[PDB]
Amino acid sequence: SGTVLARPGASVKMSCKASGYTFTYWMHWVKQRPGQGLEWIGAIFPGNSDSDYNQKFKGKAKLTAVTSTSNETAYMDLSSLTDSAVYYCTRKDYGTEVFVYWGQGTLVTVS
């Protein structure tokens, strides 16, 4: 949740409520643009707050989490038109590779 229409330059905070597990080893934000392309937005290791992002959103988005309340956050700032897309979060299991689903989406639209 946290999505919706926002004017270019605006800010927005998405959330991600987990249940099933008390913690995943890596939670990821990944988006899918209207032309169906998938992009990696960020990844944070909670409980130390380390982060990593592509240049695309470097310095504008800020991933974070709350190991206590079981929440994953994405704080987008200085939104651009190209950030329009569906946003998902996923856990990356230990000996697993890429990031594995559990989010149903949440459409952000910058216009």
Partner: protein
């Protein structure tokens, strides 16, 4: 990064299909495959190059070396239509392939 070919893949039920990806650097066997059925979130099929994910039927198999990895469906069934995506998991950032839409050839 990643390159996925082909873009579209018309296939008949029962047919076999192969979708491949290539990378720019050596990524060992760190590679997975996602199926995004239409109107749904993506789902995992294979991870660790060849390891089948929980619940996935054995008609799907993965393989690959150095840079090139392939997903194969031996007998395509109706439920398998949608867009497939590879994604590397060797070192950050993990980046996904552009996608291959599988459409079922029908009468």
């Amino acid at each position: 990064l990643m390159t996925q070919i082909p873009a579209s893949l018309s296939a008949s039920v029962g047919e076999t299909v192969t979708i491949t990806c290539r990378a720019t650097k050596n990524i060992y066997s760190y590679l997975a495959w996602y199926q995004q059925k239409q109107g749904k979130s993506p789902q995992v099929l294979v991870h660790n190059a060849k390891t089948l994910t929980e619940g996935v039927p054995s008609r799907f198999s993965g393989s690959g070396s150095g840079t090139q990895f392939s997903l194969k469906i031996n007998s395509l069934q109706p439920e398998d239509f949608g867009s497939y995506y590879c994604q590397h998991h060797y070192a950050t950032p993990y980046t996904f392939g552009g996608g291959t839409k599988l459409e079922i050839k029908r009468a």
